[PDB]
Design a binder for this molecule. Structure first.
Ligand SMILES: [K+]
Ligand SMILES: [K+]
Lengths: 292, 294
């Protein structure tokens, strides 16, 4: 029964934990200019007003603040920073939804999940490669929150979450522009900015991909919207590339960049900041940070 | 549940030995001093497996010395490995398969090295949370290499508190003398199967678990990966106190060796740990980590 989750989200126990986490996470200000050091006093004054607005679906998230971060290669990393109030509410929601979805998620999904990290994905993939599955299908997706259809995503979420008050606020956060901090691509470890709820939502939809791959008996790892599939031959890899790309676009409504997607051997793959090499003493593929 | 006074027969069971064989073949690796390739182990065991089992039962099995192997590091320089023969990797794995589940239930949640489903990045994440809670004076004790310095009697005494099977104690001690060691390629940010590590890292964790318990008793915030520990403290004064107290415990109680010149108290930006450095992200107002220059 998921029809009455809002009061769990709004319980004093859950909100106190969310507050403490958000202040621990610090982070830049959102569009309202409020610093994380101001949240305590703000909630002392306005917390009951905010809870009331959420209960009646009259709370309006602020748009995320768009920040551009220079990349080492001359590109730009885009971040969407929620206000600290919205980080708090997002964290409160995620604390309740995370345990629900942890029961559904696949063991080879590693991104933005409790006690999981990029290095675990790498080690799982290496074990598959060293078992002979060293033709890699590297499907490149356009940014999840730039391309996902909100109606499709909310429909998937609603298969589990029956509480319409929670559905309503989650949709409003999609509209506000929440997104995935991709600094892990540069081998960075640490708290993502603006990531209390968006990565979970992406994992809910991409769990459908995990289930399709599992139905096909495929060897894969996934970290948010970045998946690699380990296959035993070039011919099979090309078939997998075609079949899974079609599934992603047709069933999930996401966009595959076919130019950036490729079939290659491990030495050609860059994944989660790592490259791969064959250790000729161990007789094993291994991984290490790729040049940036 | 197994009986810790009667573990040798569990180690030597068909099921355990088949699993150990499978894992050693999956791990591949270089040959030891006998020149035996991992693909030759099965035929060797078809002929000699029952002989080896019987030798182990009477404490007459003789481990071969590890082979010293020098290989390139990806970024320059050389890494030195001590490679057991594939037979010894097999027996080591068979022992470890029985000891690991016992010790996994004793170990501390902030120990991350050479343990199932754990990795260096988890240690980094835990440390970053401690740093960002204000514990940004880092006690960085540098230990000389564990297997170059550990006192065998002290180690076997600790093991024997749990493992009451004298035949297991006997073979573990012989593997110490054979030169088993810890592949340190994680220091270069490498992820993948270590060489020569089926038993040695577990033994190091058994001893260093004594340190973890002491640090936990003292309420300290730490992470540890094999013999590489950092401790996160709230002030320089407290860090100097922790440095003094914990270094003394390591040397006096565990008999390990601190390197005076390389142990220090520093802030995160001066720490290199498991291939990572630490930095202050000005936008996030937080410490984060990324691979340090190699
Ligand atoms: K990919
Ligand atoms: K250290």
């Amino acid at each position: 029964d998921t029809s009455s989750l809002m009061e769990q989200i709004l319980s004093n126990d859950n909100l106190n934990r969310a507050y403490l986490q958000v202040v621990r996470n610090k982070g830049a200000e959102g569009v309202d200019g409020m610093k994380y050091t101001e949240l305590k006093e703000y909630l002392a004054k306005n917390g009951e007003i905010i809870k009331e607005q959420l209960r009646i679906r009259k709370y309006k998230p602020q748009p995320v603040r768009r920040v551009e971060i220079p990349k080492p290669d001359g590109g730009v990393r885009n971040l969407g920073v929620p206000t600290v109030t919205d980080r708090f509410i997002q964290q409160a929601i995620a604390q309740v939804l995370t345990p629900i979805y942890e029961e559904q998620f696949h063991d080879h999904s590693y991104g933005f999940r409790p006690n999981r990290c990029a290095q675990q994905a790498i080690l799982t993939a290496l074990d598959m490669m060293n078992d002979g599955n060293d033709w890699i299908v590297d499907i490149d997706l356009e940014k999840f929150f730039d391309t996902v259809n909100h109606d499709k995503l909310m429909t998937i979420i609603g298969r589990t979450i029956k509480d319409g008050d929670v559905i309503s606020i989650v949709r409003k956060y999609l509209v506000s522009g929440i997104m995935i901090d991709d600094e892990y691509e540069d081998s960075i470890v640490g708290t993502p900015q603006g990531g209390n709820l968006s990565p979970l939502l992406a994992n809910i939809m991409l769990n459908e991909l995990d289930k399709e791959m599992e139905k096909r008996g495929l060897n894969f790892v996934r970290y948010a919207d970045d998946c690699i599939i380990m296959v035993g031959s070039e011919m099979s890899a090309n078939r997998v590339m075609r079949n899974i790309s079609r599934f992603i676009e047709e069933k999930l409504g996401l966009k595959v960049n076919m130019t950036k997607s490729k079939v290659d051997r491990p030495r050609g793959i860059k994944y989660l900041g790592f490259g791969f090499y064959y250790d000729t003493s161990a007789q094993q593929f291994k991984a290490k940070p790729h040049a940036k």
